[PDB]
Amino acid sequence: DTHKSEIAHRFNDLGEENFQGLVLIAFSQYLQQCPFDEHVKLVKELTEFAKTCVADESHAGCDKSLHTLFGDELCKVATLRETYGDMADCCEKQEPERNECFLKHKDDSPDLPKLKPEPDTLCAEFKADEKKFWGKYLYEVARRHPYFYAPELLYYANKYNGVFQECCQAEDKGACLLPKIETMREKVLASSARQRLRCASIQKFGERALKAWSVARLSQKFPKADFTDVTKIVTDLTKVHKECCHGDLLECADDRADLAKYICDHQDTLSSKLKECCDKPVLEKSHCIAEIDKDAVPENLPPLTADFAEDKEVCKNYQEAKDVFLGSFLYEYSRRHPEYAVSVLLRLAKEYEATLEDCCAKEDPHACYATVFDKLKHLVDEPQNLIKKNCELFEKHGEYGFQNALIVRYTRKAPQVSTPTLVEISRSLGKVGTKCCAKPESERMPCTEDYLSLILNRLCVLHEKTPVSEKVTKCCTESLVNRRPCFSDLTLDETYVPKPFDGESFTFHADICTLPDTEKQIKKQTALVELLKHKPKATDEQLKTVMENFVAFVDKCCAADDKEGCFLLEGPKLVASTQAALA
Numbered sequence: 001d002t003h004k005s006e007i008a009h010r011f012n013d014l015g016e017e018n019f020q021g022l023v024l025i026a027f028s029q030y031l032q033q034c035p036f037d038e039h040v041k042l043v044k045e046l047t048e049f050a051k052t053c054v055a056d057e058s059h060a061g062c063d064k065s066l067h068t069l070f071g072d073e074l075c076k077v078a079t080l081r082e083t084y085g086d087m088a089d090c091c092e093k094q095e096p097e098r099n100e101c102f103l104k105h106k107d108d109s110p111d112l113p114k115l116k117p118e119p120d121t122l123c124a125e126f127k128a129d130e131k132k133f134w135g136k137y138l139y140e141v142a143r144r145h146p147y148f149y150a151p152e153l154l155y156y157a158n159k160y161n162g163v164f165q166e167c168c169q170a171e172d173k174g175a176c177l178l179p180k181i182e183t184m185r186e187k188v189l190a191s192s193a194r195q196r197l198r199c200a201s202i203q204k205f206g207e208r209a210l211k212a213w214s215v216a217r218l219s220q221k222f223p224k225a226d227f228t229d230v231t232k233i234v235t236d237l238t239k240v241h242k243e244c245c246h247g248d249l250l251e252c253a254d255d256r257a258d259l260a261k262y263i264c265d266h267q268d269t270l271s272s273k274l275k276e277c278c279d280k281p282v283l284e285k286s287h288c289i290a291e292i293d294k295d296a297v298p299e300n301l302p303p304l305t306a307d308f309a310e311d312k313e314v315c316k317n318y319q320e321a322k323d324v325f326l327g328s329f330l331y332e333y334s335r336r337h338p339e340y341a342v343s344v345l346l347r348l349a350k351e352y353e354a355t356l357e358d359c360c361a362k363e364d365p366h367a368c369y370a371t372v373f374d375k376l377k378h379l380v381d382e383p384q385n386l387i388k389k390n391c392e393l394f395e396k397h398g399e400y401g402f403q404n405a406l407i408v409r410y411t412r413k414a415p416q417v418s419t420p421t422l423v424e425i426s427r428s429l430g431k432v433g434t435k436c437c438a439k440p441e442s443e444r445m446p447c448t449e450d451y452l453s454l455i456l457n458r459l460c461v462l463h464e465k466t467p468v469s470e471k472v473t474k475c476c477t478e479s480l481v482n483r484r485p486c487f488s489d490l491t492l493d494e495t496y497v498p499k500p501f502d503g504e505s506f507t508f509h510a511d512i513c514t515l516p517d518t519e520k521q522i523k524k525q526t527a528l529v530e531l532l533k534h535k536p537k538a539t540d541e542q543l544k545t546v547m548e549n550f551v552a553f554v555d556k557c558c559a560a561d562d563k564e565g566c567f568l569l570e571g572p573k574l575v576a577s578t579q580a581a582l583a
């Protein structure tokens with residue numbers, strides 16, 4: 001829904017508080033390096049102009065696009081050419097391409113401090129100015145995660161203030177805040193990863209890909225809903241996601257608020273779980289609906305074969321209404337199977353598609369696809385088998401050893417990838433074992449597939465920035481729903497030529513001794529990646545042996561009276577024993 005004067009329309013619809021937040025988020029994601037108070041000045045300016053348009057729409061500029069108003073306001077700043085050399089040229093053009101320049105200049109790995117929460121500090125800041133405190137959270141998160149879902153960011157910022165309203169009056173503040181903050185952080189990072197993937201899917205694969213994921217996903221949430229209604233909500237949600245992924249943040253939030261009201265209006269025909277969401281204020285209500293659990297499979301549904309294998313008009317429908325037919329298949333399969341990962345359901349519908357494209361060209365099509373459902377079942381078996389093998393490994397070795405196995409796997413599959421990225425990604429992938437291996441059957445397939453999709457998407461995002469591996473290129477571009485199976489099926493990349501051991505290639509030193517154990521591990525895991533890059537054909541055993549000798553070497557030297565001496569002296573011995581082990 002567009003008005004002639006969009007600034008007024010969205011300020012009217014959103015209220016000042018949320019309008020300002022979204023403006024601040026917008027400024028923070030387009031210009032991730034600029035100071036807080038710079039953006040804050042621009043937000044206040046925009047709010048005033050918003051007000052004048054609400055009072056009088058005929059007044060000059062009020063009919064401007066929001067892109068125009070936002071971008072002009074960003075291009076107030078005199079020199080940030082120094083900060084954005086590649087993007088200082090953005091202010092040199094206009095809509096719609098000035099916006100597209102901003103968009104392409106978002107940094108997925110900004111050079112920004114992992115900020116340590118400091119309780120006394122943050123509590124003081126809360127007291128001085130809690131509005132500034134809320135805004136600061138928006139700016140710090142939005143600048144680090146420039147595709148963060150803007151209306152959920154407001155939700156999290158209200159929750160963050162909530163933690164401080166509670167905790168900063170307690171006798172012990174650290175003990176109060178900290179566990180709430182680490183808990184919230186994990187949810188925030190999860191949200192950031194989900195939205196990064198939604199935007200990546202829109203960007204690389206078209207909104208149709210997101211549309212498909214959401215038909216499957218919503219059919220599991222709202223299985224008693226009819227297909228008309230699931231389609232109407234997916235259309236609306238897809239528009240919201242596309243808005244937020246394109247920086248149309250005020251539209252994004254206004255449209256998500258309307259959808260929330262639509263869903264709560266129809267709660268009786270969607271899910272009984274919505275009762276818990278539907279009396280909440282707007283951001284909370286949207287959050288709660290977005291997080292809703294899967295509903296019970298409705299009773300007495302027909303066999304799938306009726307509409308998709310028996311009916312004489314199968315090939316007719318595929319032909320004359322392809323996307324509605326395949327959407328229908330996704331809804332009907334999804335509503336019958338909440339224990340299916342959404343990615344598995346999308347793979348079933350892809351193979352069903354391929355089966356008709358093949359069969360509907362035959363003299364007797366039904367003879368050809370009669371058994372399609374019988375055949376689909378391997379798409380369920382394959383992941384269940386992979387889950388069972390990998391949780392066994394996790395169970396026998398724990399998270400660290402599991403991350404080590406994964407480092408070994410991914411360095412073999414993509415040895416061209418930067419050592420920090422192989423380590424970051426491998427570590428992330430290993431956490432699926434803690435997250436998911438102890439879940440029951442109802443939930444273990446969705447937990448693993450969802451979580452692995454998020455992490456492989458991070459890899460794809462990093463790989464797109466500087467392409468190095470032909471195989472990773474393949475798995476990241478071939479097909480979104482086959483991404484995970486693609487990465488799982490990559491083998492050791494023999495195209496890669498190791499660069500030899502020069503002698504003393506990677507050297508541990510005394511500064512390692514004083515690091516927190518997490519950091520010590522990462523140093524060892526980096527050592528491991530580097531070993532594999534020199535000896536890309538090393539066996540599992542040889543890698544186990546060298547890693548044990550690494551662990552022994554650091555433990556021993558960090559215990560020495562003279563630590564650096566130990567390193568310098570015992571270094572060569574380790575090099576020699578290693579060389580003789582890798583022969």
Ligand SMILES: O=C(O)c1cc(I)cc(I)c1O
Pocket residue numbers: 020021024040043131132133134135136
């Ligand atoms: O930081 C402030 O002082 C501030 C003030 C206002 I008024 C609105 C937002 I968002 C802010 O961040």
Ligand SMILES: O=C(O)c1cc(I)cc(I)c1O
Pocket residue numbers: 115116117141160181184185186188189
């Ligand atoms: O994103 C963070 O790193 C983060 C940092 C702090 I301090 C508090 C919360 I909640 C966070 O999510």
Ligand SMILES: O=C(O)c1cc(I)cc(I)c1O
Pocket residue numbers: 218221237256257259260263286289290
């Ligand atoms: O992802 C959302 O933001 C979302 C928002 C609403 I409102 C409803 C559903 I289902 C969602 O998935």
Ligand SMILES: O=C(O)c1cc(I)cc(I)c1O
Pocket residue numbers: 383386387390391432433448449452488
């Ligand atoms: O490594 C995999 O290929 C893998 C795939 C699936 I699906 C589940 C788990 I746990 C895994 O470890």
Ligand SMILES: O=C(O)c1cc(I)cc(I)c1O
Pocket residue numbers: 397400401402404405408528540543544547
């Ligand atoms: O502990 C493991 O399960 C493990 C497995 C492999 I494969 C390689 C290394 I180094 C390991 O530490």
Ligand SMILES: O=C(O)c1cc(I)cc(I)c1O
Pocket residue numbers: 194197198201209210213217449450451453454
């Ligand atoms: O929640 C989503 O809408 C979502 C969308 C895609 I595309 C992939 C994953 I994992 C998701 O969780």
